[PDB]
Design a protein around this ligand. Sequence first.
Ligand SMILES: c1ccc(-c2oc3nccc(NCCN4CCNCC4)c3c2-c2ccccc2)cc1
Length: 271
Amino acid sequence: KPWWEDEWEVPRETLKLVERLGAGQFGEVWMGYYNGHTKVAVKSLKQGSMSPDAFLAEANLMKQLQHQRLVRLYAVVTQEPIYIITEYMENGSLVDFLKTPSGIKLTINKLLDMAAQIAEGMAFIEERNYIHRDLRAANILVSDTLSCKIADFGLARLIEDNEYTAREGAKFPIKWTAPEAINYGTFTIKSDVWSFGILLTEIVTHGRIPYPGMTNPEVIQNLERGYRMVRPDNCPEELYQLMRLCWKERPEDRPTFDYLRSVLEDFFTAT
Ligand SMILES: c1ccc(-c2oc3nccc(NCCN4CCNCC4)c3c2-c2ccccc2)cc1
């Protein structure tokens, strides 16, 4: 809809940017307030750093993916500098949170709880015929109540047919991406499942980089041999085997996110 008819467009005057949470090549993300009292996250686009349409495309997709387990779109300011305002998560990125004094003290029980919460969010994405493609601990946000939500939908895509094919030149984080995606540029929800497996290792190691001591070439070589990531230190064996399911050779053999959610919830209610 046109901005003068769009429910999400808001006057820039309604926003007060208070603290910067991140600065980058394409813009910044600040902590701020909407209409004085409501805490929000404000992603601002650096003019000329990238297409405004590309930037706003994520907001448009977020309009279609509303759920308690996904960071919620709040509003947009479509006049430069362009803003996308969303729900604020008091404890930042999961990869960062797990390294703080609080994160470090979390029990395996709570880590599994968080894992299930993430799988729950992905299960929604799965059912709505969407894919995320950038599933990793850095893209999971944590609330003041230690609940987790899926973030960054820049690479997310509505899957009209079973799979999405990227651009031959497109590059992705080798360690978190499924083989078929790395080799063919083909992404499916099953590609996200593989990524979830890697994310689980990030959780249990409190933010450690996957495949410790290995370069990307080494990871690919080993994977092709049928090897998978070595059991992380102090990783419960049941969780490790759940990870293995996510890393099955055939995408179709990997479990659904609803299955993963169900199992992780059992793991949690057991501990
Ligand atoms: C300390 C520090 C940050 C936050 C924090 O609160 C947030 N609320 C909503 C969306 C957010 N971010 C949306 C965009 N992120 C998604 C994850 N990748 C980086 C960009 C953040 C972030 C944030 C911003 C940049 C990088 C990482 C987290 C709270 C406390």
